[PDB]
Design a protein around this ligand. Sequence first.
Ligand SMILES: *Cc1cc2c(cc1C)Nc1c([nH]c(=O)[nH]c1=O)N2C[C@H](O)[C@H](O)[C@H](O)COP(=O)(O)OP(=O)(O)OC[C@H]1O[C@@H](n2cnc3c(N)ncnc32)[C@H](O)[C@@H]1O
Ligand SMILES: *Cc1cc2c(cc1C)Nc1c([nH]c(=O)[nH]c1=O)N2C[C@H](O)[C@H](O)[C@H](O)COP(=O)(O)OP(=O)(O)OC[C@H]1O[C@@H](n2cnc3c(N)ncnc32)[C@H](O)[C@@H]1O
Ligand SMILES: OC[C@H]1O[C@@H](O)[C@H](O)[C@@H](F)[C@@H]1O
Ligand SMILES: OC[C@H]1O[C@@H](O)[C@H](O)[C@@H](F)[C@@H]1O
Lengths: 573, 573, 90, 90
Amino acid sequence: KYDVVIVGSGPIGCTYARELVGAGYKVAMFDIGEIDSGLKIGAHKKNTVEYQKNIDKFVNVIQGQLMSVSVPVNTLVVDTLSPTSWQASTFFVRNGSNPEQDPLRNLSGQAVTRVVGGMSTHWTCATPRFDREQRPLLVKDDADADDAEWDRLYTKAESYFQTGTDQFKESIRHNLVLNKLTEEYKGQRDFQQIPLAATRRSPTFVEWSSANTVFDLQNRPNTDAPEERFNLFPAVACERVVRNALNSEIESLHIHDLISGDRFEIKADVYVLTAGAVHNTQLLVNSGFGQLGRPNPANPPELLPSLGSYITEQSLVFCQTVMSTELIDSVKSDMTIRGTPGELTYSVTYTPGASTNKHPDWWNEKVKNHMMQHQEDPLPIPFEDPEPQVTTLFQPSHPWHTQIHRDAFSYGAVQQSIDSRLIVDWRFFGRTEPKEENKLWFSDKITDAYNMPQPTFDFRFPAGRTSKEAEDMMTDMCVMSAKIGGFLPGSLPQFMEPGLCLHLGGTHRMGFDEKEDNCCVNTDSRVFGFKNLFLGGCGNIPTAYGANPTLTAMSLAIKSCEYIKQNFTPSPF
Amino acid sequence: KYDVVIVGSGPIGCTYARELVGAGYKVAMFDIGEIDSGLKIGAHKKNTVEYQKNIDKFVNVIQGQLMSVSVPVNTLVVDTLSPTSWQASTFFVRNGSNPEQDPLRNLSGQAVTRVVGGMSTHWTCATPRFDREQRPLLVKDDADADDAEWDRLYTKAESYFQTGTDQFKESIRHNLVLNKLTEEYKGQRDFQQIPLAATRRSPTFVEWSSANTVFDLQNRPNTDAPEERFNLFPAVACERVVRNALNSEIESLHIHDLISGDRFEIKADVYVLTAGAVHNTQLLVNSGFGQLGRPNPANPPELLPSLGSYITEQSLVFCQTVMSTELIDSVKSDMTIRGTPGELTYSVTYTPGASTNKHPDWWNEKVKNHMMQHQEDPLPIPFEDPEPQVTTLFQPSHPWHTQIHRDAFSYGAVQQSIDSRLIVDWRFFGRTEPKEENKLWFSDKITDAYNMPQPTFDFRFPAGRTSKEAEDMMTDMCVMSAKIGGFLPGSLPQFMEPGLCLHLGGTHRMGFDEKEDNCCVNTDSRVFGFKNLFLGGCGNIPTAYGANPTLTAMSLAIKSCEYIKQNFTPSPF
Amino acid sequence: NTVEYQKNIDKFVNVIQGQLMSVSVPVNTLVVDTLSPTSWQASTFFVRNGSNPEQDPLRNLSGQAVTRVVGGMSTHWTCATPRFDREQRP
Amino acid sequence: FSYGAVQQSIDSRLIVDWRFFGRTEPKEENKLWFSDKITDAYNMPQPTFDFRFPAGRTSKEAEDMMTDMCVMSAKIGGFLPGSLPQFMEP
Ligand SMILES: *Cc1cc2c(cc1C)Nc1c([nH]c(=O)[nH]c1=O)N2C[C@H](O)[C@H](O)[C@H](O)COP(=O)(O)OP(=O)(O)OC[C@H]1O[C@@H](n2cnc3c(N)ncnc32)[C@H](O)[C@@H]1O
Ligand SMILES: *Cc1cc2c(cc1C)Nc1c([nH]c(=O)[nH]c1=O)N2C[C@H](O)[C@H](O)[C@H](O)COP(=O)(O)OP(=O)(O)OC[C@H]1O[C@@H](n2cnc3c(N)ncnc32)[C@H](O)[C@@H]1O
Ligand SMILES: OC[C@H]1O[C@@H](O)[C@H](O)[C@@H](F)[C@@H]1O
Ligand SMILES: OC[C@H]1O[C@@H](O)[C@H](O)[C@@H](F)[C@@H]1O
């Protein structure tokens, strides 16, 4: 018997943990995955010395914990088998594929991650605010009070994630790029560092934030927290919430302990679901919310008819560029060079303080030292120079989010022929209109690896503004990127597979009125009709957004938690 | 001040830990890597529910922690850059490549793993004994006493690893294959399960063994062990052992704490190095054993002239096959089938106990149930059937080790068009004659990611018996594999890149006499001349072997540890 | 039999490929899901580009091809001309 | 007729091709037929195959053939990477 139970240990779950453990509640949290981030439970897997010294390898850790949501049945022809080998007569259901899934109306890139800390054990840590145009309303008919509420919430989210905008300020590459783009767009667009949930520990090490940063996930009571109560149970699949006959309250949570194989029930006062945009919906549909099976509009759902409808996922465009000869030469423009590399007459100098210098002294010293210490290297950038982390945030005249950076998730055979110091990544994310016909649904016959109803998408990028925007977005990346360098062969401009970006929203969407706004939770993230059930995460977001959604989702959880502290009393100690 | 210090936390290091912590010694162990296997320190990363339910993804975790040893300078021509992009005039030293390395005399597949538990946090767990022909002598001129010593040591190694040969006995696929190969080679070759360091917990879960299984790596004293003393220090790069002027004793170990960045010295009575075949040699060469820089036979080394010479790595050949129509039909040969799948008249039956049945009742029940429950599936093998784990061990008439199995390390884009139940992997490993000219050496100018001397190989498979064997090995795989099925397109018979198999040996080799046997350690694994320095691991193995070397290496550590308990007194408590 | 092809014999593969027209190409079912949202996108794997909807892809001779030029296939062939022994011969 | 991206890294003087051709039992069920609805480029009835290598001797032979090429070829050299032993498309 707990005061609160939380399903999932990602950063939205940990947000509830932090708020409620902190306010004196007896909390239990379950995760279907296991502890595997070392002694800091749920921490970023990229915070090892070895991965910050071999950062290209980290793509392998990401790929290792992205399990695809719905893989259609495979119809590739293999006709060079030996005549003796067993050969198919048909393309029958093979290797865990989903026969419900139409391959042509899928989010084939969508994937889930099942480990303690969720996806925040691998993510890129970008945490921008949404402006009004991308954000759901929290106050009706009062634009300025809506702004102040969002500002209050986001400011708190940013402290929980340790969001900052200056961790890369001493990078030559970062500033090379930033300054050129500010110059080029002078006035018309503003560039800044990507706000990043991260703290720099040294010039070659960044402590990336995660679920652990929000809440350390250590069981309580303990010496550091002797009057808090928290227990995390890993390797427990949560399968169903039990409704009372009134559909006004949840009475238990049904679970499957994966180690013993036993099934149990858990009672609490408050039930919170933060299993992710896909798995929140799966658990609700298994519990008799929404509708199970292929959509059938001839059978109105009894509860939450909007559940699994109006889903959104962003369009993503990508390339890499190789830095221009112009930009590279500009790095060393305050240097006087005499002699020729490798003689002992060779001299690279600058005047410290010189009003005519284009760069600050610190920049010139790095360049001087690199050039003198490494006289066989043909580039003026130091080898340990941190990577760029540049953005122009979404605006009405350019309604996409942009990252001009170095992401650990490479999409191709990472290449070796071009010096890494020259390479810049470009990712532009578009916003997607919510439409009722775009759906995530669950099979009433096919089941997944955990014997739960198999997830199935029915999705196309909407015609009209979504599609026009996505193609204007592609053109913008082409135009903007040419300012910095030409494309890197094998990383040419392209749309990524649908759902690869993992920003899926609106699967359990938020609004003021269940009917009128076609929604599932209210602005306290409470499920309509039910006193003690709440949903957290990106699934709540009802709007068309291009920016990275997690900080937003956290803000909404903070507000949800105020509702809980004002409406439920913690058990005595 | 410790009684014993151990460099590295892989399973050979943990062998010393187990023996010496157990015998009452005050032990400290350092690793340059960090704890990241969840709450069981140094355990197999494949022991999560999620990875045993998505086993194809585990290749990504392996690739994520294999960092290449020596990558030659890249000379690929990229001539489709934009004219504006910075373009090279030469193939200069880029992206951490090693200019000392000849690309044509490399072990390009060789890689190291830096995490607590070492490579045993990802390995395949195959642990066969070497027969006489592959094994170094531990007793001179007495074949039968040599056998009994090896038998005593191996039996102890097998308990520490929990080696077994029946964990797969209930697999239809495993037995399908095993029985056909026994029949086909009747008499001339014997097949058995690959001995595996592993314990089955259920029909769909195997608890794979690791460094953790040898020694749990928990600091001591603790409640379970109140009179033992052990401390593990992760993220500490060990750089040098300090010799006394007599070169008869080590006086300290110099270390670099990677978190603070500070450098310290550690004193102990006994020094043990188990940093792996490559990193043991690197640490010794940094300490003035052997010779630093490109080999120069005009400057005889002062200590251990054989260090880094006579290295061996095995040749590896690979394919996959698709199971024959014949073999698949044989799975269901005791079944009477009436009706046609999917009608309600459909019936699949057998007689339990029938003397005329080719299979045991348990086999027939699985097949019956699968066929009746899954009437849309065209194969008689159940979906959760465990994978084959078959071997014919090395013999003089077939001097290669063989694995006929399913390995988590796939080498190609894992494919989806052919049902996984039909696929069998074939890996044949050859033995390599030790030659003085085959070397691992360290640069006196280039340094690696940890500012240590850059490793550089000079290696070719020896002409003569090694090469003839490797090509007869390839032919054997071709011949033997056809008995089970034809090759899977995209997995055709091939030699793998040199060193991919990660069985490198002889970099610090064992013998009776330093001069006479061209060696570095004696049969107690003690370094010649030095009272208190020992080396563990595959680097000790002086012979040409085809079988997986780790169990052997453990056996040698067990013997080393007897020497220590008989020659050094633990500090009082 | 040109001087230029006997001096650059690797290029002759291109002349062979240039006159082998496939006999029966089943309907294509490859998924292309990285089209721009603005581009025309199929709802089904309909009959495209001269493919044959009668053809089962799994019971084909997909490599079979014909050559339509004066001299037929003997304008590109390898010229191997062995006798059949009794066991192969009508 | 090379089947792959002709390669340049290994001297052509070292390279030898191996092609082993098997015999196929005639079976009534293996057919070439023509569509009464689909037509080809010359408005003639579209050719359509219904073919599998026969079970029994044909298939056993084809796999013993593959093994023979493997065994025989090793006498001359090892396989060239990117030209490894394979069945060609039917
Ligand atoms: C993978 C990835 C993800 C993101 C980025 C890049 C990469 C490669 N980058 C990124 C993202 N978001 C941003 O805003 N900024 C960035 O730069 N990524 C997305 C981000 O990582 C997610 O939006 C965020 O985690 C969502 O948090 P959450 O709502 O707490 O959900 P999680 O998926 O992280 O964790 C949920 C959780 O629940 C479990 N689970 C699932 N089913 C169950 C059941 N049935 N019972 C119990 N537990 C369950 C999981 O195992 C998991 O831990
Ligand atoms: C990666 C891999 C390895 C093996 C198999 C498959 C795969 C994909 N399969 C396998 C193997 N061996 C077998 O006999 N059977 C199998 O089926 N693999 C090899 C096996 O995994 C190794 O032979 C074994 O670990 C060797 O053990 P070890 O001698 O204890 O060495 P490790 O590499 O495991 O650990 C050494 C260790 O030392 C560290 N390190 C390195 N440098 C330093 C310095 N300078 N200071 C401190 N520590 C250092 C590492 O970080 C590491 O933990
Ligand atoms: O695909 C990688 C991208 O994935 C997204 O999930 C992130 O929000 C981006 F920051 C990131 O670059
Ligand atoms: O490359 C994978 C192989 O690596 C080797 O290190 C192992 O000993 C084999 F068992 C394994 O199949």
